[PDB]
Design a protein around this ligand. Structure first.
Ligand SMILES: C=Cc1cc(O)cc2nc(-c3ccc(O)c(F)c3)oc12
Ligand SMILES: C=Cc1cc(O)cc2nc(-c3ccc(O)c(F)c3)oc12
Lengths: 228, 10, 225, 10
């Protein structure tokens, strides 16, 4: 399986566009958190189908499949969030019917801090002019690299996806030095996506513990499994 | 255990 | 400044190893946390001197400097810990006479798990056969990339260290494709160092609240950020 | 502030 063919399979694994089916209206702390959680739950279902479509993923032991997804889910959701927001500065496109402004994150205590992080990182990917194919590899790497017989498979799969990202960068046709700097820059931004996801989890857990948000089953499980 | 059932069904 | 001059600069900038002795009696939850907090406090002081030697660091605004350091200090401490333990599988060299076995992490509620991921990452580094010059670049990158026109200068500084990392990897003589592959493999591990770094800080806050060990001055300021 | 001191006073 060549780099181009692996990248295409990721394109094919891409989850469908998700909408929360909400008529446009002003956000309150209740409506916002209810929307974020409802959207996260829907995306989680699509995320599972996505991972299964990654060559070799289902070949992994069921234990690894579970622990990989339980640890990275929020990070994957946020990476998706940033690719959707790339062409819309100042905005966070969680979903077509869930577009938020920085000032709207002020109605929920502690979230403004996080929106600013997401907006910053997104602004950074925009500066680097992240390409769709780079997005695809990076997102897959997030899943395969969250591993904090089946072990070698994971390493092989992760290596293959890295190999694919290098290929994508090589196709851009920029100098070899600029290809090394770009690869390093994209990989270093993940640390920032990971940071904003750690904060998003802390904030979400806090919200669940207060039963302030109806935490749907899949999302409750993903959340409960992570902190544990 | 929705995660596990979604990982074992299509 | 060429990539080589930058590496030579960081090489000299390396902080000297902090000397701290292992308690005479076998570790207790408290004596261990005391050993760790004390070592960290001493290393933190050296870390500040090390940072000011990273070309251009002192040229950033005092606020960027502080934000950068508060944001990554523990990850920097652990990167150094992993490098020191590179050649000692199953062993964690917090310092010359503070060699903790993976087992001793039992006397501290919830630290063993952290010792395990620290040892795992260390093995990944051993497996990649991380080189001293690569290590120096990566550790500095940890500091300059924790951004968690001084902003414009921070980027330039980060690219310079990245440029040096690329230069060092080229000096290994492997194919251009493998140079790219090794670069990716090295950086993908920053996520794991970071993970153990977050588990370590959260675990330290917890021990402080549990009054299991006193945490003040420099260490406390960094803990709260 | 200790951090600030080490960064500027040292
Ligand atoms: C922003 C902080 C944040 C805080 C919180 O308490 C719950 C959240 N849920 C998300 C979220 C949902 C769907 C996505 O696709 C995504 F990228 C993020 O972000 C959240
Ligand atoms: C292991 C978890 C851990 C937990 C905790 O509550 C306090 C800690 N301090 C360190 C530490 C100290 C000096 C170092 O040089 C280093 F790398 C780590 O690790 C700690």
């Amino acid at each position: 399986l060549s780099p181009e063919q692996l990248v295409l399979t990721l394109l094919e694994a891409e989850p469908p566009h998700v909408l929360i089916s909400r008529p446009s209206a002003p956000f309150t702390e209740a409506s916002m958190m209810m929307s974020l959680t409802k959207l996260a739950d829907k995306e989680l279902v699509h995320m599972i189908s996505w991972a299964k479509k990654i060559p070799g993923f289902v070949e992994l032991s069921l234990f690894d499949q579970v622990r990989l997804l339980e640890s990275c889910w929020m990070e994957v959701l946020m990476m998706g969030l940033m690719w959707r927001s790339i062409d819309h500065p100042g905005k966070l496109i969680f979903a077509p019917d869930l577009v938020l402004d920085r000032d709207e994150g002020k109605c929920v205590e502690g979230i403004l801090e996080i929106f600013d992080m997401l907006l910053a990182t997104t602004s950074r990917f925009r500066e680097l002019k992240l390409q769709h194919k780079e997005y695809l590899c990076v997102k897959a790497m997030i899943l395969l690299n969250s591993s904090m017989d089946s072990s070698r498979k994971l390493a092989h799969l992760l290596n293959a996806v890295t190999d694919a990202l290098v290929w994508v960068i090589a196709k851009s046709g920029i100098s070899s030095q600029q290809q090394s700097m770009r690869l390093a820059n994209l990989l270093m931004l993940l640390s920032h996506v990971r940071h904003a996801s750690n904060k998003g989890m802390e904030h979400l857990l806090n919200m669940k513990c207060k039963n302030v948000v109806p935490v749907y089953d899949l999302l409750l499980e993903m959340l409960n499994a992570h902190v544990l | 255990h929705k995660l596990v059932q979604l990982l074992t069904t299509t």
